[PDB]
Structure formats: C-alpha cells, structure tokens
Design a binder for this molecule. Sequence first.
Ligand SMILES: CC(=O)NC[C@H]1CN(c2ccc(N3CCOCC3)c(F)c2)C(=O)O1
Ligand SMILES: CC(=O)NC[C@H]1CN(c2ccc(N3CCOCC3)c(F)c2)C(=O)O1
Lengths: 190, 190
Amino acid sequence: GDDRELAILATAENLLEDRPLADISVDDLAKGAGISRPTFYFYFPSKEAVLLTLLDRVVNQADMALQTLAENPDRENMWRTGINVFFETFGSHKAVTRAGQAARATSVEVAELWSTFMQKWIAYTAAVIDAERDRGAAPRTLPAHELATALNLMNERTLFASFAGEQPSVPEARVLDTLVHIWVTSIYGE
Amino acid sequence: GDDRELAILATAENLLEDRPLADISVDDLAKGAGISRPTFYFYFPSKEAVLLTLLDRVVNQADMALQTLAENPDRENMWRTGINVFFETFGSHKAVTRAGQAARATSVEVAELWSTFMQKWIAYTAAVIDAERDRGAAPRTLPAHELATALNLMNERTLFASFAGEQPSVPEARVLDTLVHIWVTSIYGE
Ligand SMILES: CC(=O)NC[C@H]1CN(c2ccc(N3CCOCC3)c(F)c2)C(=O)O1
Ligand SMILES: CC(=O)NC[C@H]1CN(c2ccc(N3CCOCC3)c(F)c2)C(=O)O1
C-alpha cells in the first residue's frame, strides 16, 4: 500500500532528472513503479499531483531542518548555517525543485504551497533580524519584514538559477558565499 | 503598413492587462487592430511572436535608458537612479513584463532575450563595482561579477513579485528603497 505510492514517487523523481513533467506520462510512472495505470489513479489523480507531493516533501524537509536549527544554540556563521539548510535540501532534490518552480505558473496548489512556506520563512527571518536589533547587534534600518522578503526572494531566484545551470547564474560552488555576504552586509550594515 | 503592426502591438498590450496570453486569440488581436486574421499572419507568425516583440521593446527601452545614464555625470544616489530605470520602465509595462516572465518557460526566444540583457546588465553592474573598488570607494570582498549576478537576480525576482502583487512581495511603494539598501550595503560593506 504505502510502498506502491512511494514507488510512484521514487519513479517520478528519477524520471524528472532526465526530462520535464510534460515529457513524462502516467504510463511511464506506472511502469517504473511496477503497477498498472488504473492502479496509479488509485493513489494519485494525475502526474501533477505526484509532483505536488514530491515538492511538499522537499519543502517540509527544509522547514523541519530549519526548525531543528532554531531549537538549538558568530553572526556570519549563524546565517551561513541557516542559508545552507536550503542550499543542501533543494540541491539534493534539484529535479523536483526545478519542476516545482515551473509548476507554479500552472498549478494553484503548487503556487499556494510555495507561497505558504515562503511566508513562514520570511516571517522567521524577520523575527531573527528583529531579535538582532533588540539586542543591539543590528542597526534599525529597513523594516525587517521588507528586508527579509527581498533577501528570501533573492535566495529563491539565485539558488534555483544556480541549480538549473541558467545563464546567467552564480556557480553552484560560489552561491553559498555570495548569498551569505549579501545577507550579513544588509542586515548588519549601516 | 507600420501602423497595422503597431496597432497589433497596442491591442496585445491592452489585452494583456486583463488576461493572460493563453486567454487571448489571434482573432482578438486582429479585431482590436481592425484587420482580418490572414492580415495578422502577414505581420506576425503567432501571438507568441507579438509578445516577443513587445518584450523586446521594453527591455531595449530599459537598456537605452541605462546607457543614457551611463554617458552622463553621492554613491547611494548613483545606484538608486540606476535601479529606478528598471523600476520605472518595467513598472510602466507591468502586463508585458509579467507575460514575458511567464513565457520564458515555454519560449526559447524569450528565454534567450531575457538571458542576453541580463548578461549585459550584470556585466555593466560588475564594471561599476570594479571601478568603485579601483578608486578605493568599495572594498575588495566578493568577486564583483558574482556579487553583480546575485543582486541583479534579486531585482528581477523582487520587482516582478511586487508588480504582480504576489504573496509574498515587497509593497511596490517600498521596493525601490529596499533594493537600494541591499545593493549599497553589499557593495560598500566590509
Ligand atoms: C538564528 C538562525 O537560526 N539563523 C539562520 C537563519 C536562516 N534563515 C533563513 C530563512 C529562509 C531562507 N530562505 C532562502 C532560500 O529559499 C527560501 C528561504 C534562508 F536562506 C535562511 C533564518 O531565519 O534563520
Ligand atoms: C554608475 C551608474 O550609473 N550606476 C547605476 C547602476 C545601476 N545599474 C543596474 C544594472 C542592472 C539592474 N537590474 C535590476 C533589474 O533587473 C535587471 C537588472 C539594476 F537595477 C541596476 C548599473 O550598473 O548602473
């Protein structure tokens, strides 16, 4: 039962590494999962729903890793370890990341899923900036929530350009340092 | 001759304010332009080609405005006036901007057009950062081209989220100040 669904999900993630979702059929997904097409539709209403579940797993993986960091005890290193959660989680799931990004234009559930977790991560970013200002380590410059929004959107666009190998992009081996520098200077700079 | 093409372009930009390109037909474009459908196809092979021409006009408008600034004579104000070129140009063409962004996923000519001008604007950003470092006004921190890439991708994503009213986004009345702060602190901060 659970294994057939997992088999579908594993096949989809494996097939997404070689071609986009538009070049993958339900028959492809069923074959790689060792099931029939009617059996597929018992577990998922569409191949788009399979992607939604894959993306949901990846964004929740990143969210739970951030929560783990948040519950635990320099300033540059604090932000680097946190940004790294997203660099490593989405970089370990590049095919799903890329396909989920492109799905936002056509899937309201995917758009709402991405929007929901971006709001959460921006609010937590803003809370950390506020706490940094409260203790006197960061200056009171921009409204923290607007600063947090821009920095998070930067990371979204820059990480996914690097993972997709877009032209232009920051080389993947340089993107962590690049983002950390911009976060640290814009949060602590006066 | 030239007027019929211009009439097609004006109709498309006007129709794109109320609905996406997928909800606009060649018959819509021909009717608003006061021509027949075969006459439309004399001027453009598809409605996607009409969008390409519209976007080409907008990115060249922004590029030429930047060139005008570049040929002419504080540091925060220098970057603000330059970022404003893109805020005003694309903000005066929000429907085309939005439709052209979404077209990158399906149109190679649109993707290459956006990629071409982003490379140009990143290289010019990097050259200004370098000149700022050469004269001693900016510290030698990140490689200037990688810094320039991240900042330009930030502006792309943040401007277009604000113009589209996405959730999350920086309010349009705050996005110029937000971006200028992040550019200035990350270029001049040590
Ligand atoms: C005190 C502490 O633990 N600091 C670590 C920071 C990291 N971080 C954060 C949030 C969202 C993101 N992003 C970037 C990538 O995509 C979306 C969200 C991010 F990179 C980093 C945050 O608030 O905690
Ligand atoms: C000395 C001088 O004239 N400085 C003004 C700066 C502004 N600027 C620049 C380039 C690309 C962008 N963007 C952001 C929006 O989308 C893509 C490119 C930008 F905002 C700003 C640049 O190099 O000149």
